[PDB]
Design a protein around this ligand. Structure first.
Ligand SMILES: *[C@@H]1O[C@H](CO)[C@@H](O)[C@H](O)[C@H]1NC(C)=O
Ligand SMILES: *[C@@H]1O[C@H](CO)[C@@H](O)[C@H](O)[C@H]1NC(C)=O
Ligand SMILES: *[C@@H]1O[C@H](CO)[C@@H](O)[C@H](O)[C@H]1NC(C)=O
Ligand SMILES: *[C@@H]1O[C@H](CO)[C@@H](O)[C@H](O)[C@H]1NC(C)=O
Ligand SMILES: *[C@@H]1O[C@H](CO)[C@@H](O)[C@H](O)[C@H]1NC(C)=O
Ligand SMILES: *[C@@H]1O[C@H](CO)[C@@H](O)[C@H](O)[C@H]1NC(C)=O
Ligand SMILES: *[C@@H]1O[C@H](CO)[C@@H](O)[C@H](O)[C@H]1NC(C)=O
Ligand SMILES: *[C@@H]1O[C@H](CO)[C@@H](O)[C@H](O)[C@H]1NC(C)=O
Ligand SMILES: *[C@@H]1O[C@H](CO)[C@@H](O)[C@H](O)[C@H]1NC(C)=O
Ligand SMILES: *[C@@H]1O[C@H](CO)[C@@H](O)[C@H](O)[C@H]1NC(C)=O
Lengths: 904, 49
């Protein structure tokens, strides 16, 4: 008894594929399965996998056709006695692994070779024998290992040469299904939703009226009559073969004598909404053709003159208690377990329990507020409600990313979480992993079971989100905890204490915005209804949908160019680079293009293009999909941002409104300090320190971009969303929406010109719907991008071309400056802000009065220091002597505290 | 191919020739001064060699 690690993979067809992932369903050998060694007849069971380092039959006797295989190969399907060569029809004369498969009479044979150990090797087809026999047993002919094939889906990987170089079993692990669902081998960290789940039924329940009798169903035919309280044995609304499983009430038979000349007059065109069964029979071995007006259905002169019947059965159902129906062995009642229903006329599935609903005596069924059957009356007069189909929901897999581990936890969304545990170990769940264990269960507050994660008591910053307040993470086996909102802090409030900063720092932070998206086009008549005319004529009937679709996509494309134009083309003149790149003590390189390099992009703007990944020639595909080019090249968009930075460096604020006015860039930074409420002396006395902080902040940005993981996250999301929408549209062309084939020229080549028009219509309607869905969702996406481009144009005017007082609009501090940089399908702002720090404590008063005259500070607050009172600004400590020019007087000090002999 | 188009065939008489290229198709657009200045126009055949 050994294990088959990854053995038994073969090419499923004879079609060449290269560099792709292909999902298929067929009989395969599950990974890490049980393989029975041999160091003896063996059952077949719909296929086997055979190795070694054959005779096929049904009874291994003379009464059952058998087969024998054997570089001279002899395949002879004859009743060889186990001297017998009779009763046979087929003859054929011309680490090793073999696969055997019996289907539709043919017996397929695959074979491989390699000079059970570990590894995987791929087999190829050899024979396909139309034996057409029944194979259940076999025996070897003389260290051979036997597997078994089961219906499973695999994901097979091809390479450039078209060789199967890997596979995945999509029913082995939760991770294996996750890989199979997203169609990849490496998976990022996160939580993904996958196939649903549902508890499988547990039993069969039947309840029929206990009345038993022999029915006159036969007497009436050979001789309007009613039949009731019998058991018949045995079409316009029912199938004859399906009549012996439904229970009716008072089946009626209409009988009369008419020759075959009038049988073709009894049918609708008999009510129009009613059903029934009609029989007729002739043997030859009155009527009215005059009446004023016709008759309503089911209501009641010459002679036919017979010379040498029609029974219209009517069925009434689900109205009164069931009394007429065929043989059905009853069953006992089971409650509180997902079972099957076969009540009088209600076949379903669910959970039963006693009810508390006051049925009226003349009622037998129940209904909800939405017309669902949430109650029933047992044929033995009992009210039991069949609430819900036991259980179902969704399944989500939590993974750290497959780059750090292969351990995952599984969440079941909406379950009491005790039913799941019972079904897992009872083998009662449709998602059936071959290798999966349960060690511990946590019940999320409202998100259901969590299996594979251990609860911890501490709290962290919610790596992966789950449920309501409960998140999960790997480093913190994976652990599930409760969210932590932040750091608890306290402040001692008082009435005569204030805090004033005594130092600051320069901070530069980045901001990423998308402004545009891909500009695609379609060829309506080529995507649908390809290079053909029989189909092209059929598509003219659907009005002019193609013209509508082309107009909508042309509107989106022309809008993307307005987006980029509105954000960047905000300068009237193209200022040349100052060819100095050192102002005051500020280093402006790495944001201005280098003149000694080929590409005219700044250093920081070159790292942004190496972060986002997308994966004349003039290539074209068969599907009619294409992407148009932008109007502004990447070298023109980069010339706009270099002009904007050059204008800010020299001439500062006043470019745009008016004409650019020079300024040495050290005088304006002083002016930018007055905006945030700090005097000029602060800059001019600490210019060297401030310049150092500026240069360091830029360097950290450059280093971070080089060695980060995801800062251009929003720009990548736009690329992924557009590629996912096109891939869905392309893969919808390999789908047959009801026709026998999904490719034209395969039904257009085998046609009758009467039957091929119905399948072509099936594809046309299916492909038109998929096109409309693509256009609708692109219109919604394009409106969301327009919102982000409108905001980016506001930030260019208010953060780059000026100074902003709106709180936290540009940056996070006080917004000295801001520089733009170009990114693929986006823009990056670098906000330079001012951050005070190093608080101190002081004593303060509202006002000061000298000689009965109060003195309020014209601008600032009063402080005490430790020796004498002073007046200072709020954002920086710079005490000043209290004089008559800092203060002003208003009234007498009767409600304002404090006094000192320091004024004037 | 992915969309169940052949895109490549084997010559019965010992060769393999690419069916991929579906020759040329696209959309045409007309550039006009506006039937007022003049009546001469230019045509753009999009995505062709
Ligand atoms: C192979 O059979 C043995 C014996 O029952 C069993 O313990 C083992 O789990 C089987 N292999 C696998 C992969 O399940
Ligand atoms: C099989 O052989 C027997 C004689 O052993 C013969 O009677 C019978 O017809 C054969 N079955 C056929 C021909 O289907
Ligand atoms: C394809 O096969 C050739 C020779 O058999 C080999 O040189 C080449 O590397 C293979 N393809 C790849 C992608 O390696
Ligand atoms: C019933 O009989 C009356 C007698 O005049 C007749 O007018 C009427 O049409 C009949 N019913 C129907 C449905 O025609
Ligand atoms: C508020 O501050 C005043 C000093 O101006 C002090 O006298 C008073 O006690 C304070 N209120 C308190 C401590 O509740
Ligand atoms: C302000 O902080 C810088 C470093 O961030 C330091 O070098 C400087 O001495 C500080 N100034 C004061 C007045 O504390
Ligand atoms: C500006 O920084 C670069 C490196 O980022 C350095 O090579 C250059 O010398 C600095 N500026 C000046 C004027 O040196
Ligand atoms: C156009 O066709 C010529 C002829 O072979 C070829 O050399 C050229 O590369 C083609 N151009 C494009 C854009 O396909
Ligand atoms: C300022 O005083 C408050 C309370 O008086 C105290 O909580 C805080 O730590 C002090 N901070 C400094 C920088 O002195
Ligand atoms: C502020 O207080 C400090 C410490 O008490 C003192 O050294 C300094 O001289 C004071 N400032 C004045 C008196 O202007």
């Amino acid at each position: 008894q050994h294990t088959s690690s990854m053995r038994g993979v073969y090419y499923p067809d004879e079609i060449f594929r290269s560099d792709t992932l292909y999902l298929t369903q067929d009989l395969f050998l599950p990974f890490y399965s049980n393989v029975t060694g041999f160091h003896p007849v063996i059952p077949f069971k719909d296929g086997i996998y055979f190795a070694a380092t054959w005779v096929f039959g049904s009874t291994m006797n003379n009464k059952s056709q058998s087969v024998i295989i054997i570089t001279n190969v002899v395949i002879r399907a004859c009743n060889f006695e186990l001297d017998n060569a009779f009763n046979c029809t087929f003859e054929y004369i011309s680490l090793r692994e073999f696969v055997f498969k019996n289907k539709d009479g043919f017996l397929y044979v695959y074979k491989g070779y390699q000079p059970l150990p570990s590894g995987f090797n791929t087999l190829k087809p050899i024979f396909k024998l139309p034996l057409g026999i029944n194979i259940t047993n076999f025996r070897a002919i003389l260290a051979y290992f036997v597997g078994y094939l089961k219906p499973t889906t695999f994901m097979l990987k091809y390479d450039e040469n078209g060789t199967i170089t890997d596979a995945v079993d999509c029913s082995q692990n939760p991770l294996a299904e996750l890989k199979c669902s997203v169609k990849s081998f490496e998976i990022d960290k996160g939580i993904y939703q996958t196939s649903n789940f549902r508890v499988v039924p547990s039993g069969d329940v039947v309840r029929f009226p206990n009345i038993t009798n022999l029915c006159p169903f036969g007497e009436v035919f050979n001789a309007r009559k009613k039949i009731s309280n019998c058991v018949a044995d045995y079409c316009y609304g029912v199938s004859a073969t399906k009549l012996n499983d439904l229970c009716f009430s008072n089946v009626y038979a209409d009988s009369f004598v008419v020759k075959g000349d009038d049988v073709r007059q009894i049918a609708p065109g008999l009510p129009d909404d009613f059903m029934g069964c009609v029989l007729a029979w002739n043997t030859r071995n009155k009527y009215r053709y005059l009446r004023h007006g016709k008759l309503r259905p089911f209501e009641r002169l010459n002679d036919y003159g017979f010379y040498t019947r029609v029974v219209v059965l009517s069925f009434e159902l689900l109205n009164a208690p069931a009394t007429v129906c065929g043989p059905k062995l009853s069953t006992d009642l089971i409650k509180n377990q997902c079972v099957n229903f076969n009540f009088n006329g209600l076949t379903g599935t669910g959970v039963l329990t006693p009810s508390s609903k006051r049925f009226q005596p003349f009622q037998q069924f129940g209904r909800d507020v939405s017309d669902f059957t949430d109650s029933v009356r047992d044929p033995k007069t009992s009210e039991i409600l069949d609430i819900s189909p036991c259980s179902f929901g969704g399944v989500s897999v939590i993974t750290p990313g497959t780059n750090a581990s292969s351990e995952v936890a599984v969440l079941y969304q909406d379950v009491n979480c005790t039913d799941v545990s019972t079904a897992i170990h009872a083998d009662q769940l449709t998602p059936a992993w071959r290798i999966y264990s349960t060690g511990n269960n946590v019940f999320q507050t409202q998100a259901g079971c969590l299996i594979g994660a251990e609860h911890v008591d501490t709290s962290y910053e919610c790596d992966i989100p789950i449920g309501a307040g409960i998140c999960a993470s790997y480093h913190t086996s994976i652990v599930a905890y409760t969210m932590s909102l932040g750091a608890d802090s306290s402040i001692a409030y008082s009435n005569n204490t204030i805090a004033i900063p005594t130092n600051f720092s320069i901070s530069i932070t980045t901001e990423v915005m998308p402004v545009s998206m891909a500009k695609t086009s379609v060829d309506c008549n080529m995507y649908i209804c390809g290079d053909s005319t029989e189909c092209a004529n059929l598509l003219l009937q659907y009005g002019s949908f193609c013209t509508q679709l082309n107009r909508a996509l042309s509107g989106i494309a022309a809008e993307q160019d307005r987006n980029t134009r509105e954000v960047f083309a905000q300068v009237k003149q193209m200022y040349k680079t100052p060819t100095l790149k050192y102002f005051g003590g500020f280093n402006f390189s790495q944001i201005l293009p280098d003149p000694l390099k080929p590409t005219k992009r700044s250093f920081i703007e070159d790292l942004l293009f190496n972060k986002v990944t997308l994966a004349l020639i003039c290539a074209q595909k068969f599907n009619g999909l294409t992407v148009l080019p932008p109007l502004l090249t990447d070298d023109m968009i980069a010339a706009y941002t270099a002009a904007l930075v050059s204008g800010t460096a020299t001439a500062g604020w006043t470019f745009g409104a008016g004409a650019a006015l020079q300024i040495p860039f050290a005088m304006q930074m002083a002016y930018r300090f007055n905006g945030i409420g700090v005097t000029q002396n602060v800059l001019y006395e600490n210019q060297k320190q401030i310049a150092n902080q500026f240069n360091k902040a830029i360097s950290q940005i450059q280093e971070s971009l080089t060695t980060t993981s995801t800062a251009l996250g929003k720009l990548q999301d736009v690329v992924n969303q557009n590629a996912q929408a096109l891939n869905t549209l392309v893969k919808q062309l390999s789908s047959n929406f009801g026709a026998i084939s999904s490719v034209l020229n395969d039904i257009l080549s085998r046609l009758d010109k009467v039957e091929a028009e119905v399948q072509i219509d099936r594809l046309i309607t299916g492909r038109l719907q998929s096109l409309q869905t693509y256009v609708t969702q692109q219109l919604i996406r394009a409106a969301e991008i327009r919102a982000s481009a409108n905001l980016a144009a506001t930030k260019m005017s208010e953060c780059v071309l000026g100074q902003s007082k709106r709180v936290d609009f540009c940056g996070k501090g006080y917004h000295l400056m801001s520089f733009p940089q170009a990114a693929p399908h986006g823009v990056v702002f670098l906000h330079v802000t001012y951050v005070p720090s190093q608080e101190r404590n002081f004593t303060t008063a509202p006002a000061i009065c000298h000689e009965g005259k109060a003195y309020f500070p014209r601008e600032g607050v009063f402080v005490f220091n430790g020796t004498s009172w002073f007046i200072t600004q709020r954002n920086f400590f710079s005490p000043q002597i209290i004089t008559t020019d800092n203060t002003f007087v208003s009234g007498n000090c009767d409600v304002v505290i404090g006094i000192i002999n320091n004024t004037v």
